[PDB]
Design an enzyme around this catalytic site. Structure first.
Site, mmCIF file in Angstrom:
data_model
loop_
_atom_site.group_PDB
_atom_site.id
_atom_site.type_symbol
_atom_site.label_atom_id
_atom_site.label_comp_id
_atom_site.label_asym_id
_atom_site.label_seq_id
_atom_site.Cartn_x
_atom_site.Cartn_y
_atom_site.Cartn_z
ATOM 1 N N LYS B 66 37.233 41.695 39.129
ATOM 2 C CA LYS B 66 37.094 40.371 39.458
ATOM 3 C C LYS B 66 36.495 40.439 41.011
ATOM 4 C CE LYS B 66 38.729 37.637 35.865
ATOM 5 N NZ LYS B 66 39.422 39.064 35.203
ATOM 6 N N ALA B 68 35.086 39.695 44.321
ATOM 7 C CA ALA B 68 35.120 38.446 44.948
ATOM 8 C C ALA B 68 35.236 38.411 46.391
ATOM 9 C CB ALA B 68 35.990 37.633 44.195
ATOM 10 N N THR B 73 32.473 44.620 51.677
ATOM 11 C CA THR B 73 33.786 44.686 51.198
ATOM 12 C C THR B 73 33.610 45.327 49.612
ATOM 13 O OG1 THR B 73 35.210 43.693 52.763
ATOM 14 C CG2 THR B 73 36.145 44.195 50.559
ATOM 15 N N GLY B 177 42.540 35.096 20.841
ATOM 16 C CA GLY B 177 43.785 35.314 20.438
ATOM 17 C C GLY B 177 44.724 34.352 21.223
ATOM 18 N N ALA B 178 45.469 34.897 22.256
ATOM 19 C CA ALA B 178 46.547 34.353 22.963
ATOM 20 C C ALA B 178 45.881 32.967 23.568
ATOM 21 C CB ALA B 178 47.088 35.202 24.049
ATOM 22 N N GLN B 179 44.916 33.020 24.007
ATOM 23 C CA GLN B 179 44.368 31.811 24.890
ATOM 24 C C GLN B 179 43.484 30.910 23.918
ATOM 25 O OE1 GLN B 179 42.154 32.686 28.906
ATOM 26 N NE2 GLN B 179 42.917 34.795 28.036
ATOM 27 N N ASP B 182 38.630 32.162 18.896
ATOM 28 C CA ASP B 182 38.451 32.884 17.454
ATOM 29 C C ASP B 182 37.567 34.065 17.437
ATOM 30 O OD1 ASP B 182 39.080 32.614 14.529
ATOM 31 O OD2 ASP B 182 36.805 32.616 14.605
ATOM 32 N N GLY B 184 35.784 35.588 14.992
ATOM 33 C CA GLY B 184 34.667 35.606 14.506
ATOM 34 C C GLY B 184 33.625 34.666 15.214
HETATM 35 O O1 LIG Z 1 35.550 35.040 53.885
HETATM 36 C C1 LIG Z 1 36.009 36.192 53.914
HETATM 37 C C2 LIG Z 1 37.163 36.607 53.479
HETATM 38 N N1 LIG Z 1 37.462 37.802 53.786
HETATM 39 N N2 LIG Z 1 36.899 38.677 54.462
HETATM 40 C C3 LIG Z 1 37.294 39.899 54.940
HETATM 41 O O2 LIG Z 1 37.850 39.825 56.155
HETATM 42 C C4 LIG Z 1 37.443 41.241 56.875
HETATM 43 C C5 LIG Z 1 36.525 41.201 57.792
HETATM 44 O O3 LIG Z 1 36.116 42.436 58.291
HETATM 45 P P1 LIG Z 1 35.129 42.568 59.719
HETATM 46 O O4 LIG Z 1 36.069 42.157 60.794
HETATM 47 O O5 LIG Z 1 35.228 44.047 59.903
HETATM 48 O O6 LIG Z 1 33.990 41.867 59.215
HETATM 49 C C6 LIG Z 1 37.136 42.005 55.659
HETATM 50 O O7 LIG Z 1 38.347 42.962 54.965
HETATM 51 C C7 LIG Z 1 36.491 40.996 54.602
HETATM 52 O O8 LIG Z 1 36.651 41.436 53.176
HETATM 53 C C8 LIG Z 1 35.784 38.329 55.188
HETATM 54 O O9 LIG Z 1 35.313 38.786 55.990
HETATM 55 N N3 LIG Z 1 35.274 36.742 55.010
HETATM 56 O O1 LIG Z 2 37.600 34.386 32.368
HETATM 57 C C1 LIG Z 2 38.486 35.299 31.871
HETATM 58 C C2 LIG Z 2 38.089 36.514 32.724
HETATM 59 N N1 LIG Z 2 38.927 37.587 32.515
HETATM 60 N N2 LIG Z 2 40.037 37.443 31.564
HETATM 61 C C3 LIG Z 2 41.125 38.766 31.515
HETATM 62 O O2 LIG Z 2 40.854 39.003 30.096
HETATM 63 C C4 LIG Z 2 42.016 39.251 29.462
HETATM 64 C C5 LIG Z 2 42.523 38.554 28.277
HETATM 65 O O3 LIG Z 2 43.924 38.827 27.987
HETATM 66 P P1 LIG Z 2 44.576 38.107 26.747
HETATM 67 O O4 LIG Z 2 43.870 38.397 25.564
HETATM 68 O O5 LIG Z 2 45.962 38.713 26.510
HETATM 69 O O6 LIG Z 2 44.212 36.573 26.968
HETATM 70 C C6 LIG Z 2 42.906 39.303 30.662
HETATM 71 O O7 LIG Z 2 43.126 40.611 31.371
HETATM 72 C C7 LIG Z 2 42.318 38.131 31.643
HETATM 73 O O8 LIG Z 2 42.678 38.702 33.157
HETATM 74 C C8 LIG Z 2 40.205 36.350 31.004
HETATM 75 O O9 LIG Z 2 41.103 36.199 30.374
HETATM 76 N N3 LIG Z 2 39.459 35.022 31.177
#
Ligand SMILES: O=c1cnn([C@@H]2O[C@H](COP(=O)(O)O)[C@@H](O)[C@H]2O)c(=O)[nH]1
Ligand SMILES: O=c1cnn([C@@H]2O[C@H](COP(=O)(O)O)[C@@H](O)[C@H]2O)c(=O)[nH]1
Lengths: 219, 220
Positions: B66, B68, B73, B177-179, B182, B184
């Site tokens: 995920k 993000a 980074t 399943g868990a969440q 379905d 199909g």
């Molecule tokens: O909004 C955000 C959130 N997190 N970071 C994190 O903060 C650090 C910033 O590094 P830098 O000073 O070398 O830019 C990095 O680890 C980066 O993933 C950001 O830069 N901006």
């Molecule tokens: O929107 C999302 C994105 N990713 N996952 C991931 O999918 C798996 C679902 O597992 P479960 O079948 O036991 O619910 C977990 O690893 C969970 O982090 C979700 O459940 N929903």
């Protein structure tokens, strides 16, 4: 409230254990708080957190941008705190249940959650920025006391501070490399996060000393 | 061309212990050749777990990380993840186009794949993600993303995501399943379903997988 030496948190995003330990060691006199993220952890393993504590005795913030469903968030927090992190950074965008899951584990293990509300990079403007105030209010509603907001947009950082209040704790990345100014950021944030401006510098210690000199009156 | 997922079924291996994770995955190997490994297992056992799965099982590996962060980074995370042997990585779209592009660029240079997560399956997704999901998907299409993740728990939203990305795009869907999703119904729109707890918490994970597959036999 967390007491960060010199209001300066090192973002240790080098991806080599030797380099990461050497550079951190070089600036150890200036800091007592290190933010460790996935670049280092995924390259060298979670054991690196305990090492950092053994070598430096620093506090460790795990910048893992937690952004999964509640059930998975709980597992991520558990694994992270088992590794010795003092705090973890969690995205607010996935909603309240996902944040609550992290808060629950943090309480269980004696740790802190930091809620990331707006990010510092240009792409943050597309979706995150328009949600950021509401995410901050959600944090307040949930009893979150620790927040992350962007150095690169001081007016947005000030708004975040306004929402959460003077009592909440606020840290801010984007200082240096991404364009944020240390002193201006510290008008609003309790501590600045600095990565590349230190760890990529010819002389990391001089870089850190320089930043601290520039904010000496704020310390 | 897309990844050829056996039985349209992807195991979400979120056990946090190497021995259990290895046992369960081995037990379903005849049903599943694609395994999604996320942070619960990786943070517990190390990135070498990807290597161990490759060595022990035939399976393709999707790293559900995920992603993000900021572009710089994101690039590092993708590089480390691909270096460890993941075939593909899952990336959030909500941090915006530059963050997604950073991942696509590394995937392109390293010969691997990005999956764009557009909307999530859990209740909290309604607060912020749902309202951005259509635009996130459209952004993906504009950036050239070919692989997507969308929620089994909201068939209407999954259907719209499929419309946006087109029939050529590859779509995988968790929350089965868990969440409450379905199998199909979800395969009406997704190329493959992701299943975690329904399989890995079962007394007999092999039987659990076999049962899911029997229930979707006509769609295979
Ligand atoms: O909004 C955000 C959130 N997190 N970071 C994190 O903060 C650090 C910033 O590094 P830098 O000073 O070398 O830019 C990095 O680890 C980066 O993933 C950001 O830069 N901006
Ligand atoms: O929107 C999302 C994105 N990713 N996952 C991931 O999918 C798996 C679902 O597992 P479960 O079948 O036991 O619910 C977990 O690893 C969970 O982090 C979700 O459940 N929903």
């Amino acid at each position: 409230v967390m007491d960060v030496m010199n209001r300066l948190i090192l973002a240790m995003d080098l991806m080599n254990r030797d380099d990461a330990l050497r550079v951190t060691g070089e600036v150890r006199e200036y800091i007592d708080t290190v933010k460790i993220g996935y670049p280092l952890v995924l390259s060298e393993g979670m054991d690196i957190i305990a090492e950092f504590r053994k070598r430096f005795g620093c506090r460790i913030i795990a910048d893992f941008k937690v952004a999964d469903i509640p059930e998975t968030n709980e597992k991520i927090c558990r694994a992270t705190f088992k590794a010795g992190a003092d705090a973890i950074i969690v995205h607010g965008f996935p909603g309240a249940d996902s944040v609550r899951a992290c808060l629950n584990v943090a309480e269980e293990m004696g740790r802190e959650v930091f809620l990331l509300t707006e990010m510092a990079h240009p792409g943050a403007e597309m979706f995150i920025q328009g949600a950021a105030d509401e995410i901050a209010r959600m944090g307040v509603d949930l009893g979150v006391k620790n927040y992350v907001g962007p150095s690169t947009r001081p007016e947005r950082l000030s708004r975040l501070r306004e929402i959460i209040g003077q009592d909440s704790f606020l840290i801010s990345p984007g200082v240096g490399a991404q364009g944020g100014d240390p002193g201006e950021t510290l008008r609003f944030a309790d501590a600045i996060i600095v990565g590349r401006s230190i760890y990529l510098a010819d002389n990391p210690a001089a870089a850190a000393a320089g930043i601290i000199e520039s904010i000496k009156d704020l310390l």
